[PDB]
Amino acid sequence: NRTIGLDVYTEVETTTSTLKANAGFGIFAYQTSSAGWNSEKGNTTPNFMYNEHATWTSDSWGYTNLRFWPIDDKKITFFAYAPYESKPEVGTDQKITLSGQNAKGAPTITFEVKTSNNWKDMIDLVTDCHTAIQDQTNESNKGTVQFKFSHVLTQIANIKVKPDVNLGTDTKIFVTGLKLDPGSTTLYNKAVYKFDNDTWEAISPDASYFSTEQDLSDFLNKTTTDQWGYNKSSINVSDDQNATALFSDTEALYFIPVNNKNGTTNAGDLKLKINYDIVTKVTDTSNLTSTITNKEVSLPKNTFKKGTKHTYVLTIKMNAIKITVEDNMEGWT
Ligand SMILES: [Cl-]
Ligand SMILES: [Cl-]
Ligand SMILES: [Cl-]
Ligand SMILES: [Cl-]
Ligand SMILES: [Cl-]
Ligand SMILES: [Cl-]
Numbered sequence: 523n524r525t526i527g528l529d530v531y532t533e534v535e536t537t538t539s540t541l542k543a544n545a546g547f548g549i550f551a552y553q554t555s556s557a558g559w560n561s562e563k564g565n566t567t568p569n570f571m572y573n574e575h576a577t578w579t580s581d582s583w584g585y586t587n588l589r590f591w592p593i594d595d596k597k598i599t600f601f602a603y604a605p606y607e608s609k610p611e612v613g614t615d616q617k618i619t620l621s622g623q624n625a626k627g628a629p630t631i632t633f634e635v636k637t638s639n640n641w642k643d644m645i646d647l648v649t650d651c652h653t654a655i656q657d658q659t660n661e662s663n664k665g666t667v668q669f670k671f672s673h674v675l676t677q678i679a680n681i682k683v684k685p686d687v688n689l690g691t692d693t694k695i696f697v698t699g700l701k702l703d704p705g706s707t708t709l710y711n712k713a714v715y716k717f718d719n720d721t722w723e724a725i726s727p728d729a730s731y732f733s734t735e736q737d738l739s740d741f742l743n744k745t746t747t748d749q750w751g752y753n754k755s756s757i758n759v760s761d762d763q764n765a766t767a768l769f770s771d772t773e774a775l776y777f778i779p780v781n782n783k784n785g786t787t788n789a790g791d792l793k794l795k796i797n798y799d800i801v802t803k804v805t806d807t808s809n810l811t812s813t814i815t816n817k818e819v820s821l822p823k824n825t826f827k828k829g830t831k832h833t834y835v836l837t838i839k840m841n842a843i844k845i846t847v848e849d850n851m852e853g854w855t
Pocket of ligand 2: 704706
């Protein structure tokens with residue numbers, strides 16, 4: 523056989539099910555001689571596939587413009603990204619701009635972070651530039667290109683809060699607001715992802731940053747409250763034993779990472795601004811509320827790491843001003 527088969531590797535919800543349900547993915551393919559990709563990439567353009575739309579139809583992955591493996595000893599190098607962008611010149615669908623059809627070498631992506639619909643529309647940009655899909659022939663893997671997508675952004679999986687002591691029965695803490703303070707020259711809102719070495723760099727000639735406080739209050743999983751007259755839309759974070767989540771189970775933030783896999787250089791390069799109420803019972807229908815707003819919380823160094831899931835656990839110290847942070851990290855797989 524000579525037709526090119528597609529497969530997407532499934533990890534032990536999966537990335538694959540998301541691609542199957544949504545827009546699928548896009549493929550770049552560069553045909554070289556037997557000499558290979560590293561020898562010839564410098565003067566090779568995506569001459570075989572340029573943003574080829576790969577979609578799932580019932581039980582298999584397919585593409586419309588059919589292509590065949592070479593009859594001779596020529597090789598094909600593949601790259602892939604997701605979610606697919608149907609307007610790659612402007613980034614209508616995903617705010618993804620691709621390197622041109624006549625650009626030489628490994629491709630690039632210019633990506634902008636989607637802040638619309640209260641952060642609920644952010645794209646989980648995945649790419650594939652692993653060597654096992656480079657220098658492929660019909661004999662490489664039974665004529666099938668197996669893609670393995672990696673998360674190239676940073677995930678803020680959750681922000682959890684708890685007091686440092688048990689508040690007893692007559693006092694509760696409610697979180698009502700949260701902002702991210704990105705500094706002025708730290709967090710990119712627009713950046714270039716390079717498939718050559720799987721790294722992010724600034725846009726040219728001038729870097730594009732988040733330089734103002736970003737309000738996350740409507741992103742938070744706030745619910746109605748009716749506690750001793752207190753009825754502000756909030757999250758009860760009173761449990762001292764287990765920190766209470768501010769994001770819902772299905773919601774997370776996906777940002778262009780800071781310093782790629784290294785994260786922030788210093789503690790407080792990135793900060794949080796939190797609002798919370800300490801409610802003490804007076805009667806069943808009345809209370810005393812202590813409202814703290816715009817309280818600064820510095821995030822630790824080596825945070826917002828590429829390919830990492832970060833969960834921040836905030837401990838509100840009841841005998842002081844202080845809010846201390848734990849950056850719990852996981853590999854984003
Ligand atoms: Cl936006
Ligand atoms: Cl800064
Ligand atoms: Cl501001
Ligand atoms: Cl509710
Ligand atoms: Cl609770
Ligand atoms: Cl530090």
